PDB file of C-alpha atoms in Angstrom:
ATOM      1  CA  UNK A   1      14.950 -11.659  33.377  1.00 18.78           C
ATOM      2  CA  UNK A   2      11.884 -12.111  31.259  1.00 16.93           C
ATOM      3  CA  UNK A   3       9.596 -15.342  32.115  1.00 17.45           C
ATOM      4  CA  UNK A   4      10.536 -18.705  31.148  1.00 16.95           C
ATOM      5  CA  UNK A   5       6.522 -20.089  31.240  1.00 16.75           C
ATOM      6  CA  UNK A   6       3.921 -17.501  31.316  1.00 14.87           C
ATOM      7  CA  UNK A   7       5.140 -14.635  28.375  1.00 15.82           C
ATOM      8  CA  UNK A   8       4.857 -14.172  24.434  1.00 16.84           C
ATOM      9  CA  UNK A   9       8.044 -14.208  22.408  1.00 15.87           C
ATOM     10  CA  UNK A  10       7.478 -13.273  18.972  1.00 14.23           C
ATOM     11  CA  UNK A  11       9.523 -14.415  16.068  1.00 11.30           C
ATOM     12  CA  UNK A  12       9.475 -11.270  13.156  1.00 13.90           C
ATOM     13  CA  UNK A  13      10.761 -14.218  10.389  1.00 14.99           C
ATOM     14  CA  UNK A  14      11.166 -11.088   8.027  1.00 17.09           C
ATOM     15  CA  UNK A  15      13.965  -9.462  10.191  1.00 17.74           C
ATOM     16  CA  UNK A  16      14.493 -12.433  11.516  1.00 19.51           C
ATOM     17  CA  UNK A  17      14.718 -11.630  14.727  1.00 18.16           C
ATOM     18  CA  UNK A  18      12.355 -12.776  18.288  1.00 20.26           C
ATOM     19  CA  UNK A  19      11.352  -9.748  20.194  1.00 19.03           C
ATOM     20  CA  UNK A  20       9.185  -9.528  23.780  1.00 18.13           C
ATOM     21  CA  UNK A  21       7.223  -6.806  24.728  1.00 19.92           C
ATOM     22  CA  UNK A  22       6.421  -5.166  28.263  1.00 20.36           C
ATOM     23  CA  UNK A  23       4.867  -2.391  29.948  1.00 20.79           C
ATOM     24  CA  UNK A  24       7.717  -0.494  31.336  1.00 20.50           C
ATOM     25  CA  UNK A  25       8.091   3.461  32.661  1.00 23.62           C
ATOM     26  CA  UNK A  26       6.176   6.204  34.483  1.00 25.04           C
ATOM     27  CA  UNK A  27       3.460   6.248  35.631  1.00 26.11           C
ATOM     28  CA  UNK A  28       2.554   2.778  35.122  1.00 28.14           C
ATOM     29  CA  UNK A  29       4.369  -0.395  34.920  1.00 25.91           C
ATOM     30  CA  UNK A  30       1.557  -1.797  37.394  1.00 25.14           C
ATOM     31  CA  UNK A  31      -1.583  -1.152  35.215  1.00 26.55           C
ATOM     32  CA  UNK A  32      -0.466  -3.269  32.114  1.00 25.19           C
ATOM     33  CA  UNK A  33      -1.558  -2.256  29.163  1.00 25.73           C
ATOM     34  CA  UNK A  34      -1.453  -3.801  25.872  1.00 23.50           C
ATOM     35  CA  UNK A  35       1.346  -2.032  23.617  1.00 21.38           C
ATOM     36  CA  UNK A  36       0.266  -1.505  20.179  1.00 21.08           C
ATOM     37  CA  UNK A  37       1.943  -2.765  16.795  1.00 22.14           C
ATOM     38  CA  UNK A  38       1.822   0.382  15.511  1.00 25.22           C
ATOM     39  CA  UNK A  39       5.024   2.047  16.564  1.00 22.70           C
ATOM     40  CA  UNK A  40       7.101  -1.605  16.286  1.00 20.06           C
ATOM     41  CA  UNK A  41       6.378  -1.838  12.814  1.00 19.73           C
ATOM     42  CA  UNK A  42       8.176   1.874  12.392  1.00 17.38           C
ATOM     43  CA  UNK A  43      11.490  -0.016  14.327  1.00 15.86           C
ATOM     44  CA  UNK A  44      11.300  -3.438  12.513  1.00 12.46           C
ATOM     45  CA  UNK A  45      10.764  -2.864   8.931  1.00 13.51           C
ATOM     46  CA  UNK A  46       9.306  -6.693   9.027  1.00 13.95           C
ATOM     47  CA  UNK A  47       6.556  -6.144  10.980  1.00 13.95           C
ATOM     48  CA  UNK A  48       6.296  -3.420   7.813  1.00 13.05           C
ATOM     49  CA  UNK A  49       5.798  -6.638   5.608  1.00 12.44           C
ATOM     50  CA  UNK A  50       4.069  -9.583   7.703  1.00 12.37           C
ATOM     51  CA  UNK A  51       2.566 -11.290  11.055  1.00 14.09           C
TER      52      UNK A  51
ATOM     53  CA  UNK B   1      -2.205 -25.705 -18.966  1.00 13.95           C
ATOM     54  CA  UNK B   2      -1.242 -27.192 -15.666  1.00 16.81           C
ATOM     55  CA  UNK B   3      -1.405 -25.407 -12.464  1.00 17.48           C
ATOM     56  CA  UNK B   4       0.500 -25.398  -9.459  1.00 19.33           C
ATOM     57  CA  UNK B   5       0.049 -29.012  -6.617  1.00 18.59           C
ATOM     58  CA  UNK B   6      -0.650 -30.887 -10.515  1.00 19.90           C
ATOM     59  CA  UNK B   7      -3.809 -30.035 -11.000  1.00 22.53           C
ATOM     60  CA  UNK B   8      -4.918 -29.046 -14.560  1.00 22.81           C
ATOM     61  CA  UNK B   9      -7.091 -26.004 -15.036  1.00 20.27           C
ATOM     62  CA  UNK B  10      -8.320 -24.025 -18.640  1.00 20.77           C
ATOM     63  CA  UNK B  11      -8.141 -20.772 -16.112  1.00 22.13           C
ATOM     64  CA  UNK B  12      -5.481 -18.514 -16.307  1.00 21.00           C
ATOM     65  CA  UNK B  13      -5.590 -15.538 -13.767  1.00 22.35           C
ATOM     66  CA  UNK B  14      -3.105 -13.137 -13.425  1.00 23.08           C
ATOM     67  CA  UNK B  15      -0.983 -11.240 -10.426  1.00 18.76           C
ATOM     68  CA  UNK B  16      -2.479  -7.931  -9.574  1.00 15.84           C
ATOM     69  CA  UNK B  17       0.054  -4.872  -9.665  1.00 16.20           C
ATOM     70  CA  UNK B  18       0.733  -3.549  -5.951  1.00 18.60           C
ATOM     71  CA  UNK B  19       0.367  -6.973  -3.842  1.00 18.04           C
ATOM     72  CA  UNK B  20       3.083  -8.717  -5.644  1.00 18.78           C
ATOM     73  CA  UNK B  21       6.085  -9.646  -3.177  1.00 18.60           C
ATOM     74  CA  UNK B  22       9.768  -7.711  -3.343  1.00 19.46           C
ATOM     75  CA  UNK B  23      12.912  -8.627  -3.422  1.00 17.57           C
ATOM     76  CA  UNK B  24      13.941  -5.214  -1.489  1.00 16.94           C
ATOM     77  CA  UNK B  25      13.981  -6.042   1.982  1.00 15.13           C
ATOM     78  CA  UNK B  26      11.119  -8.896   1.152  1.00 12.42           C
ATOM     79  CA  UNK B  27       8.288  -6.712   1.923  1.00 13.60           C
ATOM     80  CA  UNK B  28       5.423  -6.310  -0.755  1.00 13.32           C
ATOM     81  CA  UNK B  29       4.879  -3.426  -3.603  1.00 18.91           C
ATOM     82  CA  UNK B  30       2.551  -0.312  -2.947  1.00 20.84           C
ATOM     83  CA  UNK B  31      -0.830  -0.206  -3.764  1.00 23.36           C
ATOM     84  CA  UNK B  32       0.105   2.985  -6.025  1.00 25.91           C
ATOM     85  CA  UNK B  33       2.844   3.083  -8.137  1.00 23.90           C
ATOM     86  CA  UNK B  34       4.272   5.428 -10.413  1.00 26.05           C
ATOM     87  CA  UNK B  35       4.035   3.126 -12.949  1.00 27.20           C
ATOM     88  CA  UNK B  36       0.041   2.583 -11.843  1.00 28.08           C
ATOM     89  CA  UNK B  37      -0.854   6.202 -12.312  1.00 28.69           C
ATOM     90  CA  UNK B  38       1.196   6.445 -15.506  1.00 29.86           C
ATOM     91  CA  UNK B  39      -1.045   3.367 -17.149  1.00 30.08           C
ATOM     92  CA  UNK B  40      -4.417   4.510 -15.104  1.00 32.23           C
ATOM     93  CA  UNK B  41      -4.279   7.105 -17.515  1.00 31.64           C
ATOM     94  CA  UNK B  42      -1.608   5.934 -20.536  1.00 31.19           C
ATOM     95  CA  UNK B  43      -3.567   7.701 -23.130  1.00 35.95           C
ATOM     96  CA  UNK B  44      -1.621  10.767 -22.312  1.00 38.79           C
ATOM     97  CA  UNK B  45       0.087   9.629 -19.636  1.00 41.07           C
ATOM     98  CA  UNK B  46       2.241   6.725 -20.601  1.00 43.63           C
ATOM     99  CA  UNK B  47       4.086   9.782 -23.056  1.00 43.54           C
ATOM    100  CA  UNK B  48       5.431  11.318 -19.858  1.00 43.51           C
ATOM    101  CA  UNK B  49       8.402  13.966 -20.453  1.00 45.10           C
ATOM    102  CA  UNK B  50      10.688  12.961 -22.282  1.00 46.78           C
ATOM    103  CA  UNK B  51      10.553   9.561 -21.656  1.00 47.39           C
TER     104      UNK B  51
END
């Protein structure tokens, strides 16, 4: 499961709909890395509109 | 006139075209519009075709 004290949960009020993000898959799961809003506001159409 | 939180102001200032806010998934109207191009030039180009 994903954290209960120590993660972001982020709450798209436009789609309505809280979302989490993490650094799965090859290579690297262990070198976190940041994942950009760019692609996430192609799959919520919210994120398309606001913050 | 009387503006919005009751104050009272001489202004007037109007919405812009292409930051107003939809009603189509309750995102927010392009920058360009058809509409804009057709009125950026209106001289000729508010006569379309046919319409």
């Amino acid at each position: 499961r994903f954290p209960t004290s120590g993660y972001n949960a982020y709450y798209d009020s436009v789609d309505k709909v809280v979302f989490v993000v993490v650094s799965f898959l090859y290579p690297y799961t262990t070198t976190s890395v940041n994942i950009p809003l760019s692609y996430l506001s192609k799959y919520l159409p919210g994120l398309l509109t606001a913050q | 006139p009387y503006d919005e939180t009751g104050a009272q102001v001489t202004s007037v200032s109007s919405t812009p075209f292409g930051s107003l806010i939809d009603t189509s998934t309750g995102q927010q109207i392009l920058g360009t519009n058809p509409v804009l191009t057709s009125y950026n030039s209106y001289t000729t180009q508010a006569n379309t075709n046919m319409q």
